[PDB]
Structures are given as structure tokens and as C-alpha cells.
Amino acid sequence: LPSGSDPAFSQPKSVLDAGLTCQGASPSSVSKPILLVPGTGTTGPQSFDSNWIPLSTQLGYTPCWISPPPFMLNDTQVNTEYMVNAITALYAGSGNNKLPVLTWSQGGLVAQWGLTFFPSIRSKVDRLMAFAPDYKGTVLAGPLDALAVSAPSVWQQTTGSALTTALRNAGGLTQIVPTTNLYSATDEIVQPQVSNSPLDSSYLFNGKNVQAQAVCGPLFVIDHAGSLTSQFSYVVGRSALRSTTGQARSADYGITDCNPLPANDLTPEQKVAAAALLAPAAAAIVAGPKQNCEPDLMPYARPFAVGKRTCSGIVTP
Ligand SMILES: *[C@@H]1O[C@H](CO)[C@@H](O[C@@H]2O[C@H](CO)[C@@H](O[C@@H]3O[C@H](CO)[C@@H](O[C@@H]4O[C@H](CO)[C@@H](O)[C@H](O)[C@H]4NC(C)=O)[C@H](O)[C@H]3NC(C)=O)[C@H](O)[C@H]2NC(C)=O)[C@H](O)[C@H]1NC(C)=O
Numbered sequence: 292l293p294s295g296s297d298p299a300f301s302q303p304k305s306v307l308d309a310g311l312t313c314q315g316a317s318p319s320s321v322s323k324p325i326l327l328v329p330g331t332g333t334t335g336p337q338s339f340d341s342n343w344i345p346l347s348t349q350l351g352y353t354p355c356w357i358s359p360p361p362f363m364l365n366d367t368q369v370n371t372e373y374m375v376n377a378i379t380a381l382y383a384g385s386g387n388n389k390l391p392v393l394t395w396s397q398g399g400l401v402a403q404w405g406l407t408f409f410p411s412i413r414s415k416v417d418r419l420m421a422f423a424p425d426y427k428g429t430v431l432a433g434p435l436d437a438l439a440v441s442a443p444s445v446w447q448q449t450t451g452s453a454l455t456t457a458l459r460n461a462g463g464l465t466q467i468v469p470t471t472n473l474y475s476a477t478d479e480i481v482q483p484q485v486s487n488s489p490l491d492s493s494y495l496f497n498g499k500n501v502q503a504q505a506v507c508g509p510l511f512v513i514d515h516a517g518s519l520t521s522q523f524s525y526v527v528g529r530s531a532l533r534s535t536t537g538q539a540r541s542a543d544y545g546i547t548d549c550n551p552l553p554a555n556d557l558t559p560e561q562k563v564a565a566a567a568l569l570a571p572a573a574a575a576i577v578a579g580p581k582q583n584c585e586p587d588l589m590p591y592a593r594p595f596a597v598g599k600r601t602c603s604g605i606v607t608p
């Protein structure tokens with residue numbers, strides 16, 4: 292696991308600041324914040340307006356979020372700059388108190404990439420609650436790659452990419468703070484997720500890894516977006532956030548909670564917005580940036596992916 296100084300940011304601090312927003316407060320003075328890291332093809336509110344912004348609010352938190360531009364489709368290492376910066380600021384703003392981080396899709400990969408290469412945030416993040424995280428990427432992004440219609444972060448979220456490699460070799464597939472990964476076998480965007488084991492993209496050694504089907508049965512279907520928004524996901528999430536140990540606890544959920552509909556505590560209009568979560572994401576991708584190769588690793592991660600190919604060619608130390 293890398294240690295010492297954080298890598299320097301490629302982006303200006305002011306620009307980063309501008310991707311960070313809190314509900315009814317300023318990052319430098321916020322009571323009991325939670326940072327929400329959005330999925331690919333979305334802003335923070337597109338990801339979370341229908342779900343954990345209002346749910347975390349009911350749980351006594353002040354939701355904050357980042358919106359890396361454009362819709363999390365740029366370089367994943369840059370999207371992490373926004374997250375490191377936000378934690379730095381939210382930890383200060385809440386009276387130097389650690390804070391939870393909760394994420395969807397790439398959000399998890401960003402969180403974990405951050406924790407892995409930016410040691411200063413390991414003592415500022417309380418815990419991590421990732422829904423459908425792709426720490427190994429997805430094999431289903433290949434077609435888009437073969438077609439050259441893949442944004443920078445889709446290249447990085449491809450299985451066997453330079454980025455997912457770099458993460459793994461640096462110690463990144465082992466949990467770094469108490470982590471809870473809630474995923475679905477039926478996920479139509481991230482795969483492989485079927486084997487309920489370290490083969491799965493959402494798995495982390497020593498994490499609380501929860502494949503919904505392994506608790507709810509093989510006919511429990513929730514999709515990539517349902518992984519975030521279902522009543523079952525809520526009950527797991529609530530467990531994770533309230534947990535004395537930082538990880539969701541089996542004592543806290545079970546078969547009575549296997550409800551794949553949208554979280555009960557949401558208003559009817561949020562339940563409708565919730566079910567359409569995937570729409571603007573699919574949109575963003577389709578008319579977003581496109582290239583025919585993977586973004587280069589930053590210097591801080593090139594040591595951990597020697598022999599992979601990025602846009603500038605073979606990576607060497
Ligand atoms: C999407 O991602 C791409 C790929 O990461 C990203 O492109 C990279 O952008 C950065 C910044 O735009 C460029 O690199 C470095 O930028 C820093 C940023 O501040 C510069 O350092 C500043 O220099 C000025 C003037 O000399 C100085 O006053 C200031 O003190 C410096 N600022 C800070 C904060 O230190 C560097 O000059 C520059 N370094 C080099 C070696 O070029 C990258 O070069 C870009 N990489 C590529 C491949 O284009 C892009 O910004 C992202 N876009 C969005 C919208 O998020």
C-alpha cells in the first residue's frame with residue numbers, strides 16, 4: 292500500500308471546490324456530513340436525488356456530493372482529485388471528525404483509488420458503503436471500446452485496463468477502511484458478479500461483500516441501479532452507516548428485507564425518479580466524449596502497471 296505524501300493534484304484547488312456541494316451548507320461548516328460519489332454518466336444529484344440525499348438526511352446526515360465533469364466520463368484519476376479534495380475539506384468543516392463515504396458504480400472505484408494512492412484521507416474516512424462498485428471494471432465495456440465510443444473512464448473501467456491493474460498491484464483490492472460492497476449477480480452493466488467470491492468485480496478482501504442473491508435467493512433481481520435504490524439496499528446501507536464497526540452487519544438484515552422495489556421511506560415521486568435513475572446516465576455516455584485508447588496513468592500509479600498500454604504506449608516505471 293503506497294504511503295507518504297499525497298500525489299499533487301493536476302487540477303486547480305478552486306476548480307475542485309466547484310465540483311463540491313452540500314445540501315443547505317458550506318463544506319467548511321457542515322454538521323455530520325456524508326460524501327456521495329456518483330456513478331458513470333451522472334452528476335451527484337442525478338445519482339442521488341431520488342435516493343440517498345433524502346435517505347441520509349432522514350438518518351441525521353448532511354449530504355454532500357461531487358459532480359466531476361462531464362458526468363464522471365473524464366479520467367477516473369481526475370474524478371478522484373475531486374473526492375480527495377472534498378474529504379479534505381469536509382473533515383475540516385465538520386470539526387476534524389471522520390465522515391462516511393457512500394458511492395455508486397465508478398463511485399466505488401474512485402473512493403478506493405483515492406484511499407489507495409492518497410494516504411492522508413485514510414484517517415478522515417469513517418467507513419465506505421459502495422453500491423455496485425467495479426474495482427475490477429466490467430467485461431461488458433468491450434464492445435464500446437472496440438467501437439471507439441468509450442469515454443476516458445469507460446476505458447479505465449474495462450476489465451484488464453491499466454487502471455484496474457494499477458489499483459490491484461498497489462494493494463487496492465483489500466479493504467482499507469471498513470467497507471461494505473452491495474452488488475447484484477444480475478447486473479447488466481458490471482460483470483463478472485455471479486460467483487459470490489473474490490472473482491466478483493465488487494469484492495474486496497476483508498470487506499463486507501454482499502451479493503444480494505446470496506441473501507435473497509437466485510430469483511432476487513435488482514439491476515445496476517436497483518443495487519443503489521431498493522428497499523433491500525437501504526436496509527443494508529442503514530446497517531453500514533449506523534454500525535459501530537463501520538461495516539454492515541448480518542444481524543441487521545435478512546429475508547424479510549428482500550424487497551427489490553424502491554426504498555419504502557421515499558416519497559412516491561422519489562420512488563418514480565428512483566426507477567428512472569439509469570436514463571440520464573445512458574444518455575450522457577451516448578453523446579459524451581469518445582476515444583480509441585485508455586488514458587495514461589499519472590506518475591504515482593505507473594510503477595504498479597508496467598507492461599500495460601495507455602494512449603502514450605507501454606507503461607514503464
Ligand atoms: C479531464 O482529464 C484530462 C486528463 O487528465 C485533464 O487533462 C489534464 O489537465 C491538466 C490540467 O488541466 C494538465 O496538466 C497540468 O495542469 C496543471 C494544473 O494547475 C498545470 O500546473 C499549473 O501551471 C500553471 C501555469 O504554469 C501554474 O500557474 C499553476 O501553479 C499550476 N497549477 C497547479 C494547481 O499546480 C501544469 O502546467 C500541467 N502539467 C503538464 C505536464 O502539462 C494536463 O496536462 C492535462 N493532461 C492531458 C493529457 O491533457 C483535463 O483537465 C480533465 N478535464 C476536466 C474538465 O476535468
Ligand SMILES: *[P@@](=O)(CCC)O[C@H](CNC(=O)OC)c1ccccc1
Nearest residue numbers: 330331396397448480568569572573
Ligand atoms: P457505473 O458508473 C459502471 C460503469 C461501467 O454505471 C453506468 C450507470 N448505468 C445505468 O444507469 O444504467 C444504464 C453505465 C455503464 C455502462 C453503460 C451505461 C451506464
